[PDB]
Each structure stands twice: as structure tokens, then as C-alpha cells.
Amino acid sequence: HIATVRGLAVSPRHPYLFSCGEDKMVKCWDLETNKVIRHYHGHLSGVYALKLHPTLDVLVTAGRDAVA
RNA sequence: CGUCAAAGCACUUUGCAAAAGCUAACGUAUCUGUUUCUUGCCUUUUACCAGAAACAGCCGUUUGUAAGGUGUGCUAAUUUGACUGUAUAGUUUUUGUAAUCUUUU
């Protein structure tokens, strides 16, 4: 990251780890390889909330865009 | 070559499915891109240098199956499978040593 890693979230169902920040960046750190796989581009500004839905493979994040 | 069974037949157009099952060229061919890292040449970013790992596209190949098209036959031809497939009256099996009678329990 380039600016304070705000969020984090490990998923239990997949060996992934997530992160967020004041970069607009949302990442998918694969835990088996220990590198990033996916960016989730779309957020207009610094993201704070990072939380992983329990059933459905789905990811929720929110920040100052004033939107989840 | 011979029998039996199945089926139109050869050639072709599309659709739809698949293509490491026990280490192996689906392609004796071979190109671009994204991300993550490492080094080059550099300060405008792009455009690039040349290595890695992870993903992707693209140009092609094979198979099965479905419907079609052309030419030929449906009073035929071709394909496909399957099979415990040969002929011997003269000594080891399919051209007879068989026939017949009687006693014992």
C-alpha cells in the first residue's frame, strides 16, 4: 500500500487476506503464494470499512465516497 | 479372403459438447497483453531493455454427437463391427471291432 492500511479481513472459506486504505485500493493477498492477485477498482476516495460476507463469496467495503 | 450383424455410402456446411485419468509434443509451430516482483537505459508518463512467478487473450489441432448440403445408390453400393473360419471314408477323435450269447447278486 501507499497510505495507511485502514482495513483488513481474513476470509475463512478461502485462503485469502484482504486490505484497504486511504489509497482507494482494495486487495486480495493470496495466502498460499503471499502475493496480491486482485485489485477492486471503483472507489473514488479513501476506503475505511472492509468486511467479508459469510455465505455468498462477496466482499463489502465503504469509505468517504459516502457509499458502501 | 470367408462368414454373420449393423448401417444407405463417399465428400462436405453449421450448431453443441468435450481434449494429462499412470510424466507428457492437444500445436515436432509460436505471438501479444494484464498483475506482482526483481534488474537495465532514464527523468515527461506512455513507448521500451530482459529475467521470474500468477493469470489471461489470440492464431490453430483432434474427437464425439446433432442437423443439414453436393454426387451417387434406396430392383444396390459402401462402410463398420463381430466371429470357437477350411473339406480328411485307408492307423490318435465324425463313415464304427461291431454283433451276439450266458452265468453270478
Side-chain angles (χ1 to χ4, degrees):
Chain A
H1 286 263
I2 319 139
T4 58
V5 184
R6 189 55 50 137
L8 290 182
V10 164
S11 56
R13 305 142 103 287
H14 338 290
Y16 291 150
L17 162 57
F18 291 57
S19 46
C20 265
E22 303 190 306
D23 308 30
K24 314 174 195 191
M25 298 286 273
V26 190
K27 306 199 164 200
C28 243
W29 305 82
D30 188 20
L31 295 170
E32 300 200 319
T33 67
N34 261 352
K35 298 167 172 180
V36 178
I37 309 173
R38 321 187 205 220
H39 302 304
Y40 297 97
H41 182 89
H43 264 297
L44 310 196
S45 25
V47 163
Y48 305 106
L50 209 199
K51 282 197 178 182
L52 303 148
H53 184 102
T55 54
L56 314 183
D57 280 27
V58 151
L59 167 75
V60 193
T61 61
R64 88 167 48 178
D65 295 23
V67 169

